[PDB]
Design an enzyme around this catalytic site. Structure first.
Site, PDB file in Angstrom:
ATOM      1  N   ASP A 146       5.981  -7.180   0.572  1.00 19.39           N
ATOM      2  CA  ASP A 146       5.279  -5.913   0.548  1.00 19.39           C
ATOM      3  C   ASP A 146       5.399  -5.267  -0.848  1.00 19.39           C
ATOM      4  O   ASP A 146       6.495  -4.915  -1.326  1.00 19.39           O
ATOM      5  CB  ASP A 146       5.735  -5.010   1.717  1.00 19.39           C
ATOM      6  CG  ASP A 146       5.370  -3.531   1.532  1.00 19.39           C
ATOM      7  OD1 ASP A 146       4.388  -3.185   0.853  1.00 19.39           O
ATOM      8  OD2 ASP A 146       6.110  -2.684   2.071  1.00 19.39           O
TER       9      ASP A 146
ATOM     10  N   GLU B 190      -2.056  -5.039   4.740  1.00 19.57           N
ATOM     11  CA  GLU B 190      -0.830  -4.386   5.191  1.00 19.57           C
ATOM     12  C   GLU B 190      -0.854  -4.028   6.693  1.00 19.57           C
ATOM     13  O   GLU B 190       0.072  -4.352   7.413  1.00 19.57           O
ATOM     14  CB  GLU B 190      -0.550  -3.132   4.319  1.00 19.57           C
ATOM     15  CG  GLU B 190      -0.194  -3.564   2.858  1.00 19.57           C
ATOM     16  CD  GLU B 190      -0.148  -2.456   1.814  1.00 19.57           C
ATOM     17  OE1 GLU B 190      -0.271  -1.265   2.128  1.00 19.57           O
ATOM     18  OE2 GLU B 190      -0.003  -2.804   0.640  1.00 19.57           O
TER      19      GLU B 190
HETATM   20  N1  LIG Z   1      15.206   7.339   6.928  1.00 21.42           N
HETATM   21  C1  LIG Z   1      14.215   7.964   6.292  1.00 21.42           C
HETATM   22  N2  LIG Z   1      13.874   9.247   6.639  1.00 21.42           N
HETATM   23  C2  LIG Z   1      12.824   9.901   5.960  1.00 21.42           C
HETATM   24  N3  LIG Z   1      12.172   9.278   4.970  1.00 21.42           N
HETATM   25  C3  LIG Z   1      12.498   7.992   4.620  1.00 21.42           C
HETATM   26  C4  LIG Z   1      13.511   7.323   5.279  1.00 21.42           C
HETATM   27  N4  LIG Z   1      13.623   6.112   4.730  1.00 21.42           N
HETATM   28  C5  LIG Z   1      12.683   6.001   3.767  1.00 21.42           C
HETATM   29  N5  LIG Z   1      12.020   7.170   3.678  1.00 21.42           N
HETATM   30  C6  LIG Z   1      10.891   7.487   2.731  1.00 21.42           C
HETATM   31  O1  LIG Z   1       9.867   6.500   2.864  1.00 21.42           O
HETATM   32  C7  LIG Z   1       9.047   6.614   1.602  1.00 21.42           C
HETATM   33  C8  LIG Z   1       8.728   5.240   1.147  1.00 21.42           C
HETATM   34  O2  LIG Z   1       8.055   4.554   2.142  1.00 21.42           O
HETATM   35  P1  LIG Z   1       7.748   3.004   2.008  1.00 21.42           P
HETATM   36  O3  LIG Z   1       6.844   2.635   3.147  1.00 21.42           O
HETATM   37  O4  LIG Z   1       9.028   2.290   1.842  1.00 21.42           O
HETATM   38  O5  LIG Z   1       6.947   2.972   0.601  1.00 21.42           O
HETATM   39  P2  LIG Z   1       5.639   2.101   0.265  1.00 21.42           P
HETATM   40  O6  LIG Z   1       5.709   0.804   1.036  1.00 21.42           O
HETATM   41  O7  LIG Z   1       5.583   2.050  -1.241  1.00 21.42           O
HETATM   42  N6  LIG Z   1       4.382   3.049   0.906  1.00 21.42           N
HETATM   43  P3  LIG Z   1       3.348   3.771  -0.181  1.00 21.42           P
HETATM   44  O8  LIG Z   1       4.206   4.781  -1.136  1.00 21.42           O
HETATM   45  O9  LIG Z   1       2.525   4.666   0.668  1.00 21.42           O
HETATM   46  O10 LIG Z   1       2.527   2.790  -0.974  1.00 21.42           O
HETATM   47  C9  LIG Z   1       9.970   7.307   0.566  1.00 21.42           C
HETATM   48  O11 LIG Z   1       9.480   8.648   0.328  1.00 21.42           O
HETATM   49  C10 LIG Z   1      11.308   7.364   1.269  1.00 21.42           C
HETATM   50  O12 LIG Z   1      12.034   8.545   0.842  1.00 21.42           O
END
Ligand SMILES: Nc1ncnc2c1ncn2[C@@H]1O[C@H](COP(=O)(O)OP(=O)(O)NP(=O)(O)O)[C@@H](O)[C@H]1O
Length: 382
Positions: A9, A176
């Site tokens: 991812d 995705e």
């Molecule tokens: N336990 C949690 N509680 C609240 N927020 C969380 C938690 N764990 C991760 N996050 C948040 O999840 C976000 C990241 O999501 P994630 O899906 O890992 O990113 P991604 O895959 O890059 N999605 P995107 O940014 O939309 O392209 C960040 O803002 C983290 O702070």
């Protein structure tokens, strides 16, 4: 000859890598011990190139030489209206080169370098590659990599090119929302089913209506908000504590970008804790003017500061159903994706929207996309 293929991812904000090993998907922790890795690059004045946690965590007053959000630019031309809007908000320099938005940075000692957005993502992919190789104990050469369902021909090709630069043969580009559905074994279902995928990450909010008909997925409609995510929730909390700090003292935090970044890192951590606990301590020694910071944030205050943003997620779900000629009743499966779906209030709001219907459960939502990619990489491995 494809060896052990990995599922990756490549997120706007955080990337994840899994693999199929001993009959099961394993999600792999990086060298800082984390199962997700910031899609971040930084360049020290001494000229060290940092990637992931080391790059996001680096305190500096020079945000110009840190690179992130390359997924917003990848596969797109310089003059793309979306690129022109995004560069307003990015602290690093973006310049027209060869029709594309190249990123220009100081690589060390005042030596400038430009990088295509796929070269940025190639660095992130190298890091994921390294993460999997340390786990496996051998080199990796092939990968399954995911993109948002709305990615077009050029964005998909540029994601493959990033792989190539990183020494990865990207065998398959999968959507995705589809990988998440795969992670939950939904492709195995019998007959026709309607799947709503609600994906709220760090930088973006994506909603997808998918149909499955005996192992064949169809992306019927997409909606969401490209500038709505976990980072926005962090900013609301930062605003809160900067405001409080000013009133309780007289000092304005914002003059010291090292101070802001310290508070950001800590606010981020607390927000995560509040998905599990009802209160969290934020504390920063030498916060501002060598004075120490200590405050507490409740889950209730976190919810209050963000409730309008949380509720705002329901409008794109409505639109998706409309454009698919469906009502809430026509949804057979709800899949929560993205780290921000760990927030209790977000899970509550989605369930209420679907009149009490439970979403799929059991895989970490920030790892489900990588998991689905690893599921496919396992079939391709042997
Ligand atoms: N336990 C949690 N509680 C609240 N927020 C969380 C938690 N764990 C991760 N996050 C948040 O999840 C976000 C990241 O999501 P994630 O899906 O890992 O990113 P991604 O895959 O890059 N999605 P995107 O940014 O939309 O392209 C960040 O803002 C983290 O702070």
């Amino acid at each position: 000859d494809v060896g052990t293929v990995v599922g990756i991812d490549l997120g706007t904000t955080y990337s994840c890598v899994g693999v199929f090993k001993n009959g099961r998907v394993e999600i792999i922790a990086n060298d800082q011990g984390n199962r997700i890795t910031p899609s971040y690059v930084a360049f020290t004045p001494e000229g060290e190139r940092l990637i992931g946690d080391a790059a996001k965590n680096q305190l500096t007053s020079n945000p110009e030489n840190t690179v992130f959000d390359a997924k917003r630019l990848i596969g797109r031309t310089w003059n793309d209206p979306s690129v022109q809007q995004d560069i307003k908000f990015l602290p690093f320099k973006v310049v027209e080169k060869k029709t594309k938005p190249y990123i220009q940075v100081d690589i060390g000692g005042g030596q400038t370098k430009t990088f295509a957005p796929e070269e940025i993502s190639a660095m992130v992919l190298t890091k994921m590659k390294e993460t999997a190789e340390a786990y496996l104990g051998k080199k990796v050469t092939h990968a399954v990599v995911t993109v948002p369902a709305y990615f077009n021909d050029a964005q998909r090709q540029a994601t493959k090119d990033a792989g190539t630069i990183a020494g990865l043969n990207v065998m398959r580009i999968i959507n995705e929302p589809t990988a998440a559905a795969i992670a939950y074994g939904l492709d195995k279902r019998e007959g026709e089913k309607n799947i709503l995928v609600f994906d709220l990450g760090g930088g973006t909010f994506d909603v997808s209506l998918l149909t499955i008909d005996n192992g064949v997925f169809e992306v019927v409609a997409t909606n969401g908000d490209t500038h709505l995510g976990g980072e926005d929730f962090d900013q609301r909390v930062m605003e809160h504590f900067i405001k409080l700090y000013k009133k309780k003292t007289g000092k304005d935090v914002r003059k010291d970008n090292r101070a802001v970044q310290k508070l950001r890192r800590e606010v981020e951590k607390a927000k995560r804790a509040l998905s599990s606990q009802h209160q969290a301590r934020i504390e920063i020694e030498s916060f501002y003017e060598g004075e120490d910071f200590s405050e507490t944030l409740t889950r209730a205050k976190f919810e209050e500061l963000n409730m309008d943003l949380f509720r705002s997620t329901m409008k794109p779900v409505q639109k998706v159903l409309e454009d698919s000629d469906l009502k809430k009743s026509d949804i057979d499966e709800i899949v929560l994706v993205g780290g921000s779906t760990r927030i209790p209030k977000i899970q509550q709001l989605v369930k209420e929207f679907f009149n009490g219907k439970e979403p799929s459960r059991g895989i970490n939502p920030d790892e489900a996309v990588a998991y689905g990619a690893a599921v496919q990489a396992g079939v391709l491995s042997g």
